[PDB]
Design a binder for this molecule. Structure first.
Ligand code: DKI
Length: 290
C-alpha cells in the first residue's frame, strides 16, 4: 500500500506545473510546482522507481510517516501520483526556504536562533508524542513559510516506535548531526533527535556543525570517542548551556523536547515567529544582488 496514492489515470504533468529545482532529498529530487486547480505553490519530490533498488521501501516509509503527521510544525503531504516510471510526491511548499539558506547572508542573532529552535522543539515534541523519531534534524531540513512559520521536512529516514519495539538501532542520519548511540547502533529513541538538535543549535549559531571540515567517515570514531562538542565563541551562557544540555553522551541526561521549551535560553530570547519574516526579507534582498 501507499498512503495518499492517487488515481493512476490522473496525470500529475497535467495537474501540476513543474518549475525549478529547489533541492535534493534523502530520496529523489524536489521541485517547486504549481497546483493547476488551486494555483497554490507546492513542493514536488520526483523519484524514478526503475532506477531505484532497495530504496522503494524507504520511500514508502517516508510517505507513510508523512501522511500520519497532522501538525503546524510538519510539512503537509497532499498525495502521490504516478507518471510512467516516476513517483510524484506532493508536499506543502514553504516560501522562506531552509534555515540553512537564511544563514547565507550572515549570522543569526540569538533571538532568531531561539525562535527557530523553539519552533523546531514544538515539532519534535509533536513527533515524539506520536512515537516518531525524525533522525535527520539539521538546518537544511528546517523550512520557513514566507510568513516565518517553522516546519520540519524530509522524513526520508524517520522512524516509528511501537509497543513491540520501544527502541530502534538502525544506522541512519547525516554524519555530522548523528548521535553517538546511533552511530554505535545501540538501542535508541527520541533522545537521538535531541542530540541532533544540539548540533543544529551550533549550526544555527556558527553556520556549520562541529567537524564540518573533516571527511564524514572520521565521525564514526570521532563522535563516539570524543567528549561531546560545545558551542565556542562569543555566545550567551544560556545558549552555550542549551547546547550542552542537548549534547550529552548519555541519552538519559538529555532533556525531552517538552522540557527544552522551558529552557532559559528559549524563554529569554525567543519572540513571535512573524518576526522571522525579516530574516526572509534579508535573504531575498541578498539574493537579489547575488
Ligand atoms: N517543502 C519544501 N518547500 C521548500 N521551499 C523552498 C526551498 C528552497 C528555496 S531557495 N532559498 O530559493 O533555494 C525556497 C523555498 N523546500 N521544500 C523542501 S521539501 N525542501 C527540501 C528539504 F527540506 C530537504 C531536502 C531537499 C529539499 F528539497
Amino acid at each position: 500500500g501507499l498512503p495518499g496514492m492517487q488515481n493512476l489515470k490522473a496525470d500529475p504533468e497535467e495537474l501540476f506545473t513543474k518549475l525549478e529545482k529547489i533541492g535534493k532529498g534523502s530520496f529523489g529530487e524536489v521541485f517547486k510546482g504549481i497546483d493547476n486547480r488551486t494555483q497554490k505553490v507546492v513542493a514536488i519530490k520526483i523519484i524514478d522507481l526503475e532506477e531505484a533498488e532497495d530504496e522503494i521501501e524507504d520511500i514508502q516509509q517516508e510517505i507513510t510517516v508523512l501522511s500520519q503527521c497532522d501538525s503546524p510544525y510538519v510539512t503537509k503531504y497532499y498525495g502521490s501520483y504516478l507518471k510512467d516510471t516516476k513517483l510524484w510526491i506532493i508536499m506543502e511548499y514553504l516560501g522562506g526556504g531552509s534555515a540553512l539558506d537564511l544563514l547565507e547572508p550572515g549570522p543569526l542573532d540569538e533571538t532568531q536562533i531561539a525562535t527557530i529552535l523553539r519552533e523546531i522543539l514544538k515539532g519534535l515534541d509533536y513527533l515524539h508524542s506520536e512515537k516518531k523519531i525524525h533522525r535527520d534534524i539539521k538546518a537544511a531540513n528546517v523550512l520557513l513559510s514566507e510568513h516565518g512559520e517553522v516546519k520540519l521536512a524530509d522524513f526520508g529516514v524517520a522512524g516509528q516506535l511501537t509497543d513491540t519495539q520501544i527502541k530502534r538501532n538502525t544506522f541512519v542520519g547525516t554524519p555530522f548531526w548523528m548521535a553517538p548511540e546511533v552511530i554505535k547502533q545501540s538501542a535508541y529513541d527520541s533522545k537521538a533527535d535531541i542530540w541532533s538538535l544540539g548540533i543544529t543549535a551550533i549550526e544555527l549559531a556558527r553556520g556549520e556543525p562541529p567537524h564540518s571540515e573533516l571527511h564524514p567517515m572520521k565521525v564514526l570514531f570521532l563522535i563516539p570517542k570524543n567528549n561531546p562538542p560545545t558551542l565556542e565563541g562569543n555566545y550567551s551562557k544560556p545558549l552555550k548551556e542549551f547546547v550542552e544540555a542537548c549534547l550529552n553522551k548519555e541519552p538519559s541526561f538529555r532533556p525531552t523536547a517538552k522540557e527544552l521549551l522551558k529552557h532559559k535560553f528559549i524563554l529569554r530570547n525567543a519572540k513571535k515567529t512573524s518576526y522571522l519574516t525579516e530574516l526572509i526579507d534579508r535573504y531575498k534582498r541578498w539574493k537579489a544582488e547575488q
